[PDB]
Enzyme design. Structure first.
Site, PDB file in Angstrom:
ATOM      1  N   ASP A  45       0.824  -1.203   0.000  1.00 44.42           N
ATOM      2  CA  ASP A  45       0.000   0.000   0.000  1.00 44.42           C
ATOM      3  C   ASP A  45       0.861   1.256   0.000  1.00 44.42           C
ATOM      4  OD1 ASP A  45      -2.530  -1.143  -0.162  1.00 44.42           O
ATOM      5  OD2 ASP A  45      -2.725  -1.350   2.014  1.00 44.42           O
ATOM      6  N   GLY A  46       2.021   1.208   0.658  1.00 43.18           N
ATOM      7  CA  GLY A  46       2.926   2.346   0.622  1.00 43.18           C
ATOM      8  C   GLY A  46       3.447   2.616  -0.774  1.00 43.18           C
ATOM      9  N   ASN A 119      -5.017   8.716   2.229  1.00 45.53           N
ATOM     10  CA  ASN A 119      -5.352   8.104   3.509  1.00 45.53           C
ATOM     11  C   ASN A 119      -5.822   9.146   4.514  1.00 45.53           C
ATOM     12  OD1 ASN A 119      -4.834   5.430   2.812  1.00 45.53           O
ATOM     13  ND2 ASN A 119      -2.680   5.539   3.439  1.00 45.53           N
ATOM     14  N   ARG A 145      -6.971  20.134  23.120  1.00 44.63           N
ATOM     15  CA  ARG A 145      -5.651  19.991  23.714  1.00 44.63           C
ATOM     16  C   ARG A 145      -5.292  18.513  23.744  1.00 44.63           C
ATOM     17  NH1 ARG A 145      -7.737  24.699  26.302  1.00 44.63           N
ATOM     18  NH2 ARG A 145      -6.077  26.104  27.038  1.00 44.63           N
ATOM     19  N   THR A 158      -9.006   2.569   7.485  1.00 43.74           N
ATOM     20  CA  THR A 158      -8.357   1.332   7.900  1.00 43.74           C
ATOM     21  C   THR A 158      -6.893   1.521   8.277  1.00 43.74           C
ATOM     22  OG1 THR A 158      -7.992   0.818   5.554  1.00 43.74           O
ATOM     23  CG2 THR A 158      -9.915  -0.149   6.620  1.00 43.74           C
ATOM     24  N   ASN A 161      -6.394   6.044  11.143  1.00 40.06           N
ATOM     25  CA  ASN A 161      -7.707   6.292  11.731  1.00 40.06           C
ATOM     26  C   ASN A 161      -8.173   5.132  12.603  1.00 40.06           C
ATOM     27  OD1 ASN A 161     -10.909   5.661  10.987  1.00 40.06           O
ATOM     28  ND2 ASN A 161     -10.517   7.736  11.741  1.00 40.06           N
ATOM     29  N   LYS A 162      -7.876   3.898  12.193  1.00 43.33           N
ATOM     30  CA  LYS A 162      -8.318   2.747  12.974  1.00 43.33           C
ATOM     31  C   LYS A 162      -7.587   2.669  14.311  1.00 43.33           C
ATOM     32  CE  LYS A 162      -8.942  -2.288  12.733  1.00 43.33           C
ATOM     33  NZ  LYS A 162      -8.016  -2.595  13.857  1.00 43.33           N
ATOM     34  N   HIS A 220       2.248   9.833   3.823  1.00 41.71           N
ATOM     35  CA  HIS A 220       3.552   9.580   4.422  1.00 41.71           C
ATOM     36  C   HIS A 220       4.488  10.777   4.342  1.00 41.71           C
ATOM     37  CE1 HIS A 220       3.078   4.908   4.056  1.00 41.71           C
ATOM     38  NE2 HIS A 220       2.257   5.456   4.932  1.00 41.71           N
TER      39      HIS A 220
END
Ligand SMILES: Cc1nc2c(N)ncnc2n1CCO
Ligand SMILES: Cc1nc2c(N)ncnc2n1CCO
Ligand SMILES: Cc1nc2c(N)ncnc2n1CCO
Ligand SMILES: Cc1nc2c(N)ncnc2n1CCO
EC number: 2.7.1.23
Lengths: 261, 261, 261, 261
Positions: A45-46, A119, A145, A158, A161-162, A220
């Site tokens: 995926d990267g 993403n 804060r 996924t 965030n997950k 990234h």
């Protein structure tokens, strides 16, 4: 038509790339990494993420495909054994396309800078305390804060965030999700705590309270921005287009990645 | 046109009801609680919830309005001081209507029973262990073990869904959110953990593994169902219609309820 | 006896300091900030934290007292109006002392460095991915991937530990608590997820998998350590000593800070 | 000495029981299930739990041992292949004993009832809303609204306590942990949210606000108590005693159960 192939750079991904190129040589397909209509990512995926940002200015002319030489990915979701069947159906064309929503991030200074995220985009402090006022549709929602905030795309739910407790959204939902990082909630500082899912045309803006320097990431890419006056989040008008050659449902992709395969 | 008014039953809500009725008497408005076109709820969100289920078979012919005699509610979101201005704009008509998505729940036996939920539907065990197979769009997603599951509407995300870690969704998003209750995750039983947001036409079904008896709630109605073969969740084709006389944004309503007012 | 007073540096904390010193002048009390037996902190918990680390090599000869010129703190837990009654009971002596546990952090290189923490010590990545093997009492417990880890003292559980989902421990329990920061849990990487509470003499060590550079914080001191071979956590043999002049229970202090006052 | 053996009741656990009894017949060991000094549980942790409550009035005269015919358990933590080596070392004696803390639960009516819990005790509503005032050491800490509360033993932290976000405590720590079930936190109702770990001699009491009927569980025994005036939690003066024939660390037992084995 015109196509190009990126590789993770290791041995297995390079050799699979040369095989598809040779297979493409048996069809009416021109290799062109400047104005391609097909972009194939081989790796993870990267690797797909880098392929997306390499051609983010031609998103409407490209159908992306991802091949995973390692574990299954949410973007690189086709096994290397499907490569010869892939080059075959890619050359004929007539395939269908699937579109996923993207996140637009605008940074205002004392000047502006805009970015697209496949993403998520995160904001953190440059070392000191992270305090921002959260303004939703010009209405001040909260003073946050904590460690930072994360705004995720549907397909990005996924990823980071997950890990922050966010929900997994099906990518056909045009929306964006905001999650908190280690928020401090006491008698005098209160955040919503729950993740927030915003529809299209809802603008979420972060405004500094004291420090105007924030470490902002977009996928990234992480850059320290200085003298920041505002950070604006909204669902992008642009979408990423995938080539669809069979059925691999998102929920099935979620099951394979987190339950077992 | 035709209208009716429900009340929480306490003194302050009854007297406000009689005042609006008397105010309605100064206009071309007929009180009819059998075929009303306007339904006014005076009390709280629970009072609104009862008004919704009282007329759930005529949802397309009714515009609901909620007045909160107590604290602000997400459905009863108008102060009692706005009653005289309310009856005024309600009698003229020409107002705009706002629609929120609803959740359809189907229960299959060894026979079927369908229900509509404005907030959420929950499933729990009849005393013993709660184990269900979770089937998304006919694909087996997971075997859930724990206290139970909750499927929430968008506007219902601020209720029980919020207490379980679910995200808050803007009600313009036609979707439903599934959250877990005290899931047991170990080496051999694994759940997704994250909340799941499903779009329209996605069918989530729960299937028994051993016990076929489940305590099923739909909003504030909780019924023990026996010899259950399947529980099906999906976004309802029906929507609830609100009368809109000014601007009270959902995110603002979220801020007032959870941050401060 | 010998005493000293630190101040937040603002106007209200400086003037309260000069008043206590003048009040101390009416008793057999010598001001000595080199070998003090009483250390008074005026400001906030952060001011107290700096006073702790200023004299961390003489912990057994000092009884600390904190005064909060702002909001109530867990260490600076006495209102400025109690200052004149404070200097009075401090000069007589015969007071009782209360002891809280501390956390020892050892950093091993390719050389060693040890630190004491009154609240917590955190480990994060120097920019890239954070991956460490977690070794409990020489038994490999897990391979952690995520943002970082936090090991908290009992009294430190109300600080950063609370924001990460950790439990609040009464400070009479000699223990340390480890919490996770945004852990990634999937099919192939799994963490415990739950916070872990370790008793005395249990050694928790973090070992690098790839990157040997970690950003290590100890209370408010954060230092980038390079070529790290191991990070060892354990309950310190040393304790911080508080002067106790009345009853302010920890749970009451928790209530006042997070429920309401 | 005197001993007895309980079984899960299935075929594999019954046959392993008859084999150990026959093996015990080759030693000076009298089978006595009325006044035993050794209690062997064959099955799972639930089988162990029933063996604990069967002899909870003779806890100081018994050393428990658990054998797991299924998956590894935290109490039944010895494989069936170790049975012949087990009966051998059990007959010689001279083994060491390990003690775990227990939780005392007192229920006051309009009369009193006391119980011991090896894992946890939970309180929930009899159908309606669950609202209790939480009183710690006679100081009112909070008004809790939600599904219920759970007070766990140290060794019980790996059970229901873990599913609710509680921390895992090493059982050598004499303490108890309180966790929340689906608490509702808004502008007007606020809970601590974090789990709370209480030391010995700290008394946590729950007091009704409206409904005086609560569904109270103690391990796997769940009873509807009516006309309840108070529920008191505290670390029990009694401890359960285990026979220790080799080294199986708690953290290792945690790793095997939740990471992989
Ligand atoms: C690059 C990437 N995108 C992802 C995604 N959308 N969901 C899960 N995992 C993802 N990864 C791998 C690094 O987290
Ligand atoms: C009846 C009701 N609906 C709600 C909602 N949608 N969001 C928050 N609170 C709500 N309530 C009050 C009881 O939880
Ligand atoms: C310095 C400090 N110590 C704290 C503590 N032990 N509990 C809660 N808050 C605390 N603060 C304030 C910064 O978080
Ligand atoms: C009976 C029992 N006790 C347990 C414990 N202490 N930790 C984890 N699991 C446990 N079980 C199995 C049912 O949850």
């Amino acid at each position: 038509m015109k196509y190009m192939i990126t590789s993770k750079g290791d041995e297995k991904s390079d050799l699979l790339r040369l095989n598809m190129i040779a297979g493409f040589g048996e069809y009416d397909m021109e290799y062109d990494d400047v104005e391609p209509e097909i972009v194939i990512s081989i790796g993870g995926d990267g690797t797909f993420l880098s392929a997306f940002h390499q051609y983010e200015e031609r998103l409407d002319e490209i159908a992306f495909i991802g091949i995973h030489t390692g574990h299954l990915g949410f973007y690189a979701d086709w096994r290397p054994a499907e490569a010869d069947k892939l080059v075959k159906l890619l050359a004929k064309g007539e395939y269908q396309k699937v579109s996923y929503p993207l996140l637009k991030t605008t940074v205002k200074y004392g000047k502006e800078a805009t970015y697209l995220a496949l993403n998520e985009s995160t904001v953190k402090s440059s070392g000191g305390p992270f305090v921002v006022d959260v303004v939703i549709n010009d209405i001040h929602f909260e003073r946050f804060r904590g460690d930072g905030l994360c705004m995720s795309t549907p397909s990005g739910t996924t990823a980071y965030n997950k890990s922050l407790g966010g929900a997994l959204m099906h990518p056909s939902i045009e929306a964006m999700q905001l999650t908190e990082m280690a928020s401090i909630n006491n008698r005098v500082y209160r955040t919503i705590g729950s993740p927030l899912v915003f529809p299209k045309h809802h603008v979420v803006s972060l405004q500094p309270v004291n420090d105007k320097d924030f470490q902002i990431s977009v996928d990234h890419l992480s850059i320290l921005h200085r003298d920041v006056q505002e950070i604006r989040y909204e669902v992008s008008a642009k979408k990423i287009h995938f080539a669809r050659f069979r059925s691999f449902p998102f929920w099935r992709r979620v099951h394979d990645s987190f339950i077992e395969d």
